[PDB]
Amino acid sequence: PFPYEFRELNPEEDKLVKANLGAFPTTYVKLGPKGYMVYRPYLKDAANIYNMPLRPTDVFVASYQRSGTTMTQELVWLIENDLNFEAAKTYMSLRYIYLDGFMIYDPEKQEEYNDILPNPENLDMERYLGLLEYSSRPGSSLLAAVPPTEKRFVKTHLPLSLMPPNMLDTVKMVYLARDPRDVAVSSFHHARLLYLLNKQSNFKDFWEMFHRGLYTLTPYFEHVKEAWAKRHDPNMLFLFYEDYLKDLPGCIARIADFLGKKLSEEQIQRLCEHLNFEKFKNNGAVNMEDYREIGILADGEHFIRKGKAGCWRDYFDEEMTKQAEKWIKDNLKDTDLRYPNM
């Protein structure tokens, strides 16, 4: 029984959002006592996702967006599949079901989406429309459709409270967290990539929205805390994006043990080299560049962008920096949550 009610954004909230994301067709609504920002179309499948039947062989990769999900998905898939790199050449989007991907699309507004493009005429309509149709399918139906004899790999940015309670009694999950400031910068660019932001909007406007819990799937800390509280569970592996950059081999090992898979030092070094930023970046199976031919990606933006930690310093001025510290200190008060890089 779905125990959550949703509410429209009040004038003040709606004002800050409609000033940065207004041009984009899909709208938001606050969900649950924590007021998680979810695209309106989410509500048609929220209860189903809360009650989604789960299987013991299911493996989830969850995170607040732009925290290292893609890397993790690749590592997790190769490790669960005997490091069959050849097979890993298929599109990541075909190897994983994006549970909450559908929500960004509202069929009722199909005509309004191509208008966010500089040249709506240069679209590969056949693929564009095929994209809209798949996205019209609730996430739960996608999972349910996968045959039992096929291991299900699920990607999601949904906080644990919107998914089946005790889901961890059945499935394994790897949750990624990353310094909120770099997440904001990466989320800013990602919004630019898909034409989600008003062109006349800048990063500071994006930051105001993001740290105030007015961007997609925030409040950021409530999302992280829910997973952090469950890190003790044997079926949960909480990792930090920063650690991937400090010692990927060590991280690869942690993920292998968690998945009950043993790897030789050679196998690990091979996985590490496979995730080298430049190689990974030009890896068409994961860089989503297959969508550029369609016309829905903005020039000068990429799914796999920089790959560094600490670049937020190039985007936050003195004030923003101070504002961010207060926000982080307040949310880390009375909790053992700590970020490796901070």
Ligand X SMILES: Nc1ncnc2c1ncn2[C@@H]1O[C@H](COP(=O)(O)O)[C@@H](OP(=O)(O)O)[C@H]1O
> Has 111 been labeled as part of a binding site?
yes
Residues in CB range of 242: below 8 A, 6 or more apart:
178, 179, 309, 339, 340, 341
- The CB-nearest residue to Hg ion is 272
Give the Cα separation of 154 and 175 in Å (integer).
12
Burial group, residue 323, by CB count within 10 angstroms (0-12, 13-18, 19+): middle
Tell me whether residue 113 or residue 215 sits nearer to ligand RTL (CB atom).
113
Query: 38 touches which of Ca ion, ligand X, Hg ion, none (CB within 5 to 8 A by kind)?
Result: none
Which residue lies nearer to Hg ion by CB, 82 or 247?
Answer: 247
Q: Which does 306 bind (CB under 5 to 8 A by kind): Hg ion, Ca ion, ligand RTL, none?
A: none
Q: Which does 296 bind (CB under 5 to 8 A by kind): ligand RTL, Hg ion, Ca ion, none?
A: ligand RTL
Q: Report the residue from 5, 86, 111, 150 that binds Ca ion according to the rule CB under 5 A.
A: 111
Q: Per the structure block, which two tokens stand in for 206?
A: 């994006």
Contacts with 96 (C-beta within 8 Å, 6 or more apart), sequence order: 61, 73, 77, 153, 154, 155
Considering only residues 59-98, where is the footprint of ligand X by CB under 6 A?
63, 65-71
Nearer to ligand RTL, 140 or 156 (CB): 156
Annotated ligand binding at 115? The verdict is: yes
Taking a C-beta distance cutoff of 8 angstroms, is the pair 253, 259 a contact? no
Q: How far is the CB of 271 from ligand RTL (least distance, A)?
A: 22
Which residues of this chain interact with ligand RTL, rule CB under 6 A? Answer: 65, 104-105, 113, 131-132, 135, 194, 291, 296
Q: How far apart are CA 15 and CA 141, in angstroms?
A: 34
Binding segment toward ligand X, per CB under 6 A, in 43-51, 58-66, 162-170, 224-232: 58-66
- Which CB sits closer to Ca ion, 195 or 207? 195
Q: Which residues in 150-209 contact ligand X (CB under 6 A)?
A: 182, 186, 189
The annotation places the binding site at: 111, 114-115
Residues near ligand X (CB under 6 A) are: 63, 65-71, 182, 186, 189, 275, 277, 280, 304-307
Residues near Ca ion (CB under 5 A) are: 111, 114-115
